[PDB]
Design a protein around this motif. Structure first.
Motif, PDB file in Angstrom:
ATOM      1  N   UNK A   1      -4.637   7.803   8.038  1.00  0.00           N
ATOM      2  CA  UNK A   1      -5.943   8.017   8.635  1.00  0.00           C
ATOM      3  C   UNK A   1      -6.780   6.742   8.603  1.00  0.00           C
ATOM      4  N   UNK A   2      -6.271   5.725   7.910  1.00  0.00           N
ATOM      5  CA  UNK A   2      -6.992   4.469   7.737  1.00  0.00           C
ATOM      6  C   UNK A   2      -6.026   3.294   7.815  1.00  0.00           C
TER       7      UNK A   2
ATOM      8  N   UNK B   1      -1.314 -12.078   9.064  1.00  0.00           N
ATOM      9  CA  UNK B   1      -2.044 -10.872   8.661  1.00  0.00           C
ATOM     10  C   UNK B   1      -1.183  -9.959   7.805  1.00  0.00           C
ATOM     11  N   UNK B   2      -1.847  -9.163   6.974  1.00  0.00           N
ATOM     12  CA  UNK B   2      -1.194  -8.060   6.281  1.00  0.00           C
ATOM     13  C   UNK B   2      -1.934  -6.781   6.675  1.00  0.00           C
ATOM     14  N   UNK B   3      -1.222  -5.662   6.699  1.00  0.00           N
ATOM     15  CA  UNK B   3      -1.826  -4.421   7.168  1.00  0.00           C
ATOM     16  C   UNK B   3      -1.442  -3.251   6.272  1.00  0.00           C
ATOM     17  N   UNK B   4      -2.445  -2.471   5.897  1.00  0.00           N
ATOM     18  CA  UNK B   4      -2.268  -1.332   5.008  1.00  0.00           C
ATOM     19  C   UNK B   4      -2.504  -0.035   5.769  1.00  0.00           C
ATOM     20  N   UNK B   5      -1.611   0.934   5.569  1.00  0.00           N
ATOM     21  CA  UNK B   5      -1.802   2.288   6.092  1.00  0.00           C
ATOM     22  C   UNK B   5      -2.023   3.255   4.940  1.00  0.00           C
ATOM     23  N   UNK B   6      -3.158   3.958   4.958  1.00  0.00           N
ATOM     24  CA  UNK B   6      -3.457   4.968   3.944  1.00  0.00           C
ATOM     25  C   UNK B   6      -3.730   6.319   4.594  1.00  0.00           C
ATOM     26  N   UNK B   7      -3.268   7.380   3.946  1.00  0.00           N
ATOM     27  CA  UNK B   7      -3.578   8.733   4.387  1.00  0.00           C
ATOM     28  C   UNK B   7      -4.670   9.310   3.498  1.00  0.00           C
ATOM     29  N   UNK B   8      -5.913   8.953   3.800  1.00  0.00           N
ATOM     30  CA  UNK B   8      -7.061   9.425   3.030  1.00  0.00           C
ATOM     31  C   UNK B   8      -7.694  10.642   3.685  1.00  0.00           C
TER      32      UNK B   8
END
Length: 281
Positions: free
Chosen positions: A24-25, A274-281
């Protein structure tokens, strides 16, 4: 001289958590080696493709007063916050651009000695706090290593404070490769900025004390040749002679929400990717 190319292909984006929840983020972090230089090198092109919810930038070399007009070409990241050195010169500097306005934005780490170089933005959201940082380099000849150690302590204490109230995501250029697996040439860099015992130990102290988990290394504990910085010199990027200096560190409580932590190796525009984070908040 002793290094040839080492292959690294970042795995596919895992966009759902271990529990099945879609991310979601999406947060993207990038040391841009100067905002204007980066824009000229089509850095915004990766940003538009990546379409993150939050973009964190380091080494903007630019104050909130003198930003390039092109930053208005990011309509989906309309809430933009900037910190720069208080002497108002063109170096260091961080930025945070967000789809939604944070509950509160702060600058620095609550210590005058460490707050004059435009290195930290704190953005508090509903369920977590995001910090982006550009950590002080230990310097050529290690002339700033003593200061770096002071910084590390102050920063760790500040972050521990934040995490005691809300789950924390820290991202940015932390200016250290934690373990040997985090740089191409560990043996020859043990006396160089970014791989001193002092700096590596500071990173370990940060993980333990807050505490925080290294999102990428958590997911890919044994994966070598994964770097985020290559010197502009000596064809280092083409040979993948690099260092992993850019991280997403997470409160342990956020691990169940962790979908993936990416390294966008092929995105040009800087000496970091770049670095990229996926979070399911």
């Amino acid at each position: 001289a002793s290094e040839g190319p080492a292959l690294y292909e970042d795995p596919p984006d895992q966009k759902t958590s271990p529990s099945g929840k879609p991310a979601t983020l999406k947060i993207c972090s990038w040391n841009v080696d100067g905002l204007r230089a980066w824009i000229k090198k089509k850095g915004l092109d990766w940003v538009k493709e990546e379409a993150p919810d939050i973009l964190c930038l380091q080494e903007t070399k630019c104050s909130e007063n003198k930003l390039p007009a092109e930053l208005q070409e990011l309509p989906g990241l309309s809430h933009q916050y900037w910190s720069a050195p208080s002497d108002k010169e063109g170096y260091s500097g961080v930025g945070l651009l967000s789809r939604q306005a944070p509950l509160k934005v702060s600058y620095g780490i609550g210590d005058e000695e460490h707050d004059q170089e435009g290195r930290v933005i704190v953005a508090e959201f509903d369920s977590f706090v995001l910090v982006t940082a550009y950590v002080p380099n230990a310097g050529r000849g290690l002339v700033r290593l003593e200061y770096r150690q002071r910084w590390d302590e102050a920063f760790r204490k500040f972050l521990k404070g934040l995490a005691s109230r809300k789950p924390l995501v820290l991202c940015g250029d932390l200016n250290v490769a934690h373990e040997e697996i985090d740089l191409r040439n560990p043996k020859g860099n043990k006396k160089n900025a970014g791989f001193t015992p002092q700096e590596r130990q500071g990173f370990g102290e940060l993980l333990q004390a807050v505490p925080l988990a290294d999102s990428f290394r958590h997911l890919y504990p044994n994966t070598p040749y994964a770097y985020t910085f290559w010197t502009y010199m000596m064809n280092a990027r083409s040979k993948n002679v690099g260092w992993r200096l850019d991280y997403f560190l997470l409160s342990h409580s956020l691990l169940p929400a962790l979908c993936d932590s990416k390294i966008r190796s092929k995105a040009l525009g800087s000496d970091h990717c770049p670095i990229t984070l996926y979070l399911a908040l």
